[PDB]
């Protein structure tokens, strides 16, 4: 542990005082956005939040509760949302307008992700058991994958828009090459409950979270299990997962944020937010020790790993 980590705690550097299901930084880690049950996407300036004692710079009202946000990796001002009606919307945060409203899903969509390398491409997953790939220049889905169970999370590989990880209520991660969707490249078994999040640390390193109270690390080059992380409590809710090159962070039903170094199976540190509440969203500020977090009361905290 000593060899890999130099941190022992998380410091609170800001707090903005109603579940927040998603908290995400824009392309430049300059703005961040929150969304959830209140049917409003709120955008904040990170530096203002850190420096000052708090008001969003943009708010966009929605027709449905929001489950996930994903900022565009090329168009700074564009952000996608998924909602409880199944609608996947692309918004412009400067004009406040919906640019695209994709309505093919028949049930709640739990997740949306904009590709980093082909930034007009976005993927969504839904309780309707479908994965849909969309292009911002086309109204109809480009790819549709019919699966056997509810899809809880979708994520593009950070190095290529040809690969997506799909976390399913069937307990497995289905890893697809979108150039041939007749069969996944590989299906990763190991979780004992639904897979609620999938996030990549790098081109070849995939992390997942599950309501079996574990995170897991997987090698998508050689299709291997790597490591299981334990300590947090997650038996029921979407509690958030975020990863960077070295660290994984997740929420807990004990109203605590947990941090793991990818080489160590038990936590580096944890933070009690302050059972009755659960952490509901987390997001690293790229490869830095700074993180955004939010809980089921709608409180937002900026945390920083510290010695």
């Amino acid at each position: 542990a000593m060899t890999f980590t130099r941190y022992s705690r998380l410091r609170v550097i800001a707090e903005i005082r109603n579940i927040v299901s998603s908290i995400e930084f824009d392309r430049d880690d300059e703005l961040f956005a929150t969304a959830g049950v209140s049917r409003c996407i709120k955008v904040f300036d990170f530096s203002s939040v850190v420096n000052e004692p708090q008001c969003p710079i943009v708010e966009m009202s929605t027709r449905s509760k929001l489950s996930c946000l994903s900022w565009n990796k090329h168009e700074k001002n564009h952000i996608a949302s998924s909602d409880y009606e199944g609608i996947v919307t692309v918004w412009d945060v400067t004009t406040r307008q919906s640019l695209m409203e994709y309505e093919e899903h028949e049930k709640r969509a739990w997740s949306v992700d904009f590709s980093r390398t082909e930034p007009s491409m976005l993927v969504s997953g839904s309780d309707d058991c479908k994965v849909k790939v969309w292009c911002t220049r086309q109204e109809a889905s480009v790819i549709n994958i019919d699966m056997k169970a509810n899809i809880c999370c979708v994520k593009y590989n950070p190095g290529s828009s040809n690969y997506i990880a799909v976390g399913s209520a069937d307990h497995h991660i289905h890893y697809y090459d979108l150039r041939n969707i007749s069969q996944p490249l590989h299906v990763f078994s190991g979780h004992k409950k639904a897979v609620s999040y999938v996030k990549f640390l790098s081109n070849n390193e995939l992390a997942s979270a599950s309501t079996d109270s574990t995170l897991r690390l997987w090698d998508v080059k050689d299709n291997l299990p790597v490591r299981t992380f334990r300590g947090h409590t997650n038996e029921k809710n979407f509690v958030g997962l975020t990863v960077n090159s070295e660290y994984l962070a997740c929420g807990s039903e004990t109203n605590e944020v947990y941090v793991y170094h990818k080489e160590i199976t038990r936590p580096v540190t944890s933070h009690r937010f302050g059972g009755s509440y659960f952490i509901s969203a987390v997001c690293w500020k790229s490869d830095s020790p700074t993180m955004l977090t939010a809980n089921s009361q709608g409180t937002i905290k900026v945390l920083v790993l510290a010695a």
């Binding site: 049950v37 489950s67 509810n150 209520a169 639904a194 309501t211 029921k236 809710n237 979407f238 089921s296």
Partner: peptide, 7 residues
């Protein structure tokens, strides 16, 4: 609620 589907 934000309960993860299972079964």
């Amino acid at each position: 609620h934000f309960i993860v589907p299972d079964l």
